[PDB]
A paper describes a structure:
P58IPK (58-kDa inhibitor of protein kinase) is a member of the endoplasmic reticulum- (ER-) localised DnaJ family of proteins (ERdj proteins) which interact with BiP, an important regulator of the functions of the endoplasmic reticulum (ER) (recently reviewed by Otero et al.). In this study we present the structure of human P58IPK, including the BiP-binding J domain. The crystal structure reveals P58IPK to be an elongated protein, with the J domain attached to the very end of the TPR domain via a flexible linker. From the structure we can identify the probable binding site for BiP based on the position of the conserved histidine-proline-aspartate (HPD) motif which is necessary for Hsp40-Hsp70 interactions.
Residue numbers in the entry: 34 to 455
The structure:
Amino acid sequence: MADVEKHLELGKKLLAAGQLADALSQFHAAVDGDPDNYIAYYRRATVFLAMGKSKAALPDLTKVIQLKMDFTAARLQRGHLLLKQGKLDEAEDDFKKVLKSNPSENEEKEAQSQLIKSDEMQRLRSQALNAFGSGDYTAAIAFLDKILEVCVWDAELRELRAECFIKEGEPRKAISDLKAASKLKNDNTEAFYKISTLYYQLGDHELSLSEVRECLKLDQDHKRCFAHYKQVKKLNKLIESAEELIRDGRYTDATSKYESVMKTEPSIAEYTVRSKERICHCFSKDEKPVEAIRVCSEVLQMEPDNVNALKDRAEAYLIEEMYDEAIQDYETAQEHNENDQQIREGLEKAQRLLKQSQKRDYYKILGVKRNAKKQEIIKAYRKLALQWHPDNFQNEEEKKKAEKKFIDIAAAKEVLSDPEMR
């Protein structure tokens, strides 16, 4: 009908304008209106492909083919797709029938180049699995890395490689594949669960949560997903809230939410380690030096390179006027993060005070200002020197201590006469 014509035409304009989502809407309308119009099926597949929707394109393309078996450009299209999906054998059968069908000169060049690739894919697949079967994981990765340049939408193999990075002790390198695999399979809940937990495991709670919400959108009654859901949702509030508080500068509150974070997930180290960094942060930003040093130091026993923990402990040491240990920290921090304005401003501001503290102040032996007025000093000296005379002290060890204060008071008067003021 005219409708199916309008759907296709608006479909066309939209696609051309890059408007994939609504183009798809319209071809959907076009397919429903005339369920036997190969053009509708073809134009939809064309969008699906444009959108990365690998699974959805295939049944539409083979429909186009079922209806119009002479239409070889759709057979070549389905050829390409299946080769992306890593359904090699079938990708070969189409690429070959394309060649047996008076192809275009550009259709011959494609159908051929592809079979050439496909041949290597079959060898690389077999090497990949074989490597994997014997436990040669780094071997398997190298093969698979190559297959997946070409088979970019082989979910199964992506999964295998993720499993490789994992056995290798490199879990984070498996986020891409596992995320990809769930995207392609589209309505497989297990794929969302796997990616949701791998995220959780890495302390990626925000994603993990959103990613399991997907599982449950697919299956409301999925037991395992829901269990995990309760879990990360709980741990998400606690962490989100913890940080809300840290920005309000409610540090002891923040610290309490973090103790809850750790109590809610004890098994995974990252949730314990990262909580401690944040607690270390709370204490330091709260001017609680001994507590900062105690917690921050423990964080560094676990992660000696923790730039954030070093900055917070540095800050603690500054409070304690521990200028050496502050620089040592700001420095060992500067090693791991090369140019940080905060680190550098810390190292200079620590050094300035390390210098100024070694610089003896005769006024610091009593003077009201860097300029105590007139005979205020003479009043201070006579009393102090008379107070602090080793004669005063019967205790031998106590005396020797007065003496240093006496030499100090005396050396003060000596330098506070006439020109020696500067």
